Amino acid sequence: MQLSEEQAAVLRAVLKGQSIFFTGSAGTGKSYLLKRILGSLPPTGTVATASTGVAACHIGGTTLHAFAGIGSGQAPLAQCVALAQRPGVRQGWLNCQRLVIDEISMVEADLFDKLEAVARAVRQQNKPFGGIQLIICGDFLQLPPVTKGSQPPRFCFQSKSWKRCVPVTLELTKVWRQADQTFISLLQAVRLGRCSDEVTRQLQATASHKVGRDGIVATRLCTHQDDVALTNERRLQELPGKVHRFEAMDSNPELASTLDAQCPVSQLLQLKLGAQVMLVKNLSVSRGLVNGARGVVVGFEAEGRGLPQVRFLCGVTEVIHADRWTVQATGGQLLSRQQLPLQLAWAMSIHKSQGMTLDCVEISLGRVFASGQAYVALSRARSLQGLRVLDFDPMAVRCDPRVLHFYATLRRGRSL
Amino acid sequence: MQLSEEQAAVLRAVLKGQSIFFTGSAGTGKSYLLKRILGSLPPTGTVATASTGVAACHIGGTTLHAFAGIGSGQAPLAQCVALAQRPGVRQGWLNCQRLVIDEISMVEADLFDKLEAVARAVRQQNKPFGGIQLIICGDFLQLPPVTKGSQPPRFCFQSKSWKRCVPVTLELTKVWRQADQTFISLLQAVRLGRCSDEVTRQLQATASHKVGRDGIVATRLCTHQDDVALTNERRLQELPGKVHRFEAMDSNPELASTLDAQCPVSQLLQLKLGAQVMLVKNLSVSRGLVNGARGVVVGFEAEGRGLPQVRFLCGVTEVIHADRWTVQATGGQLLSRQQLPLQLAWAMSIHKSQGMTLDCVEISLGRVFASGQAYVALSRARSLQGLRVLDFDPMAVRCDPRVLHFYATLRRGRSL
Ligand SMILES: Nc1ncnc2c1ncn2[C@@H]1O[C@H](COP(=O)(O)OP(=O)(O)NP(=O)(O)O)[C@@H](O)[C@H]1O
Ligand SMILES: Nc1ncnc2c1ncn2[C@@H]1O[C@H](COP(=O)(O)OP(=O)(O)NP(=O)(O)O)[C@@H](O)[C@H]1O
Ligand SMILES: [Br-]
Ligand SMILES: [Br-]
Ligand SMILES: [Br-]
Ligand SMILES: [Br-]
Ligand SMILES: [Br-]
Ligand SMILES: [Br-]
Ligand SMILES: [Br-]
Ligand SMILES: [Br-]
Ligand SMILES: [Br-]
Ligand SMILES: [Mg+2]
Ligand SMILES: [Mg+2]
């Protein structure tokens, strides 16, 4: 694809060796541009990471936690430095010339501070972040920071080292995920916490949307995985068909926990006729069989493993064959899982949707959400006709004042 | 694709739980059928192997050496059992219910005997091969057995435990790789050591073949990698263009040797305008961009890494982007390499062609070759007009008498 002028400016800064933060609304092509950046660089000395396993998958990277190799990051700095000096971990720190981080908004400032300090200590380079070229992107108006500790987290930009570490800031301002300017304008009002009467009426009108197709119902977006598991298990149980089982094969079952964070499929996949499923690997972009595609199980092959036949929203029916995930864990340890690329999809967490495009979703937005969380949910949908919002109330839409102040300081001095 | 009656009979035997050896000429779909078998089985308890790294890649498996975890296999049986009892190796032995082995002809009888004894000792199951369902294929009239020792190797069928371990034998007899019955008939005469006057005249006539296309020359097949390296290096040096470098990124540089056995690309790929290259990953079966495809470097992109533009024999010109190989080493350890899927291809070893289809080849066959080695070289070509044989003489075509006796015993009692 033709990069926009804005995307080309970011790639030019990266190839000049500039540390950069680039930002933009949901669906502006940040993660796409990271893939193009990675393609444009030598793989030696280039580390691709994201804040979360879900986001790391999108760019073929690892988690920032796995790269860093400092445990949780909560131990004292001396303990974290000793962990980073372990065989494998240390060579990763020493060999890293360029560190890509997607979905920065989930990285708390105290962790950024720890990583900056470990980088200097392991590399014995007394410069910001040990001299590593940082290539960071995300949207601070999307999912907020998380912490392995118990204190209220600070946004990454609050780190006293942030601006020294990413001195260049560029923006991507053209939304590609949604094609419809009416929906783009609605989403921007939500992102900024500006729900006019018109915006609220337009979101409430979606309560009547018939988002599915024959036999395909909406995926409910939920704030917590407990509620997702409960819903998917109950809806599967209620189907009359016999259960069909597909067991995953893992290279390292003792590290299942580490592999699950980054892999979107389960050790045990159970299906029935009528099961609502999400495809979680690109199979055929031309046929619309893409990551996030929704369908319904319409049959099982008679032969062999009895693989499922899935009809998708686009109208294509396909037998779904095995696939594989390889996850980079601590040091450079690699883990694999072989499984069908399907998950049950009556429900899905907002966190697990991070960075995805979806097209058949429902969400209840009648209570207080975390800063950015309602915006992330709404901005997954490719079009309004694939979105059903129940009980919408701008109480759900919250923007942390720290983030609005941050973006005002970013804007200061710019033409627009 | 519709399996033949013969292929379906092998898959039926496998799904009944029968240990089996299935055999056939070059290009009869043995490795294809193994992929279909693997697709029809649960991945848990199913181990995909081949005798060589080259052959393991074709089926997405590991080497038999890597799975077994007994070192070279030359140590005493007690030391081999202790090696197989290591953490990770032992669980692979205990968890294995079905063991697939492609290209069995390279497995010497003494190693088969050691593996059968290790299987019983580690699993504490006093039945052939520890009770593992064996799914074995190959062609004993192809590449002969190799040994990590210094004694003349025995063919795998000479093992005293061979027939007890694979009690069922089935054949695939329809060649698919070549479509031309003239060429199929010539190849069968070579396989059986039956070079009539007419067979030798037809092979000698190919000395005049123009096998290339504009700017594309034949890959010379060589018996030894020393001669391949020398030829590819000298031909690259002689080109006038500046050198372009592409350095691989390996998860584990300390196990490069382990990764190279299975990976068809180098740590350092050097290219020039005019370089003769082989694509070594499927990119587009649709457009003829398949494993083994030959082309010529016609340009380098101006942007980013300066990726190569390659024109292939089929007429397609494509920019060649990074790819990745993941290799399963001992005890479930996974290794990766990121590199462009190109190798220099003025020359290639016969051993590295094992199990491949090629389209643009030359071979000098005026020397004594190993049993099956001339047949393997000749049977890589999809068609005769992609093959140039220099100095052909039947002295090059040898069939080990042990193998002809084995196949006579296999045939005994059959209808045909
Ligand atoms: N230059 C471009 N022209 C057209 N489509 C583009 C371009 N760049 C990106 N896209 C498309 O934009 C869509 C969204 O890209 P993506 O990389 O997910 O954006 P993002 O900013 O990372 N989204 P999010 O993670 O939700 O904030 C993808 O389907 C791309 O195919
Ligand atoms: N049933 C089939 N119908 C048509 N083509 C087939 C069929 N089975 C296999 N093929 C084709 O046969 C070709 C050769 O298959 P392959 O699996 O390489 O054979 P092989 O017996 O393993 N060859 P070799 O390893 O050289 O002895 C492939 O291109 C397949 O596409
Ligand atoms: Br410049
Ligand atoms: Br609001
Ligand atoms: Br609906
Ligand atoms: Br979820
Ligand atoms: Br609600
Ligand atoms: Br001993
Ligand atoms: Br002969
Ligand atoms: Br010569
Ligand atoms: Br010769
Ligand atoms: Mg993204
Ligand atoms: Mg084969």
Numbering used by the authors:
A (entry chain A), B (entry chain B): 205 to 620
Source paper text:
The structures we report are of constructs from residues 206–641 (apo hPIF1) or 206–620 (the structures with nucleotide analogues bound). During ATP binding, represented by the AMP-PNP structure, R381 recognizes the γ-phosphate of ATP. R584 also shifts in position to interact with the ATP γ-phosphate, fixing the α13 helix (domain 2A) relative to the ATP-binding pocket, while Q346 from motif III coordinates the ATP γ-phosphate. Importantly, this conformational rearrangement of the 1A–2A inter-domain linker (W380 and R381) during nucleotide binding causes a significant ∼4 Å shift of the N-terminal end of the α9 helix, which in turn induces a structural rearrangement of the 2B domain. ATP binding results in a 4 Å movement of the N-terminus of helix α9 (helix α9 corresponds to the conserved motif A) while the C-terminus remains relatively fixed to α13, which is immobilized by interactions (R584) with the bound nucleotide.
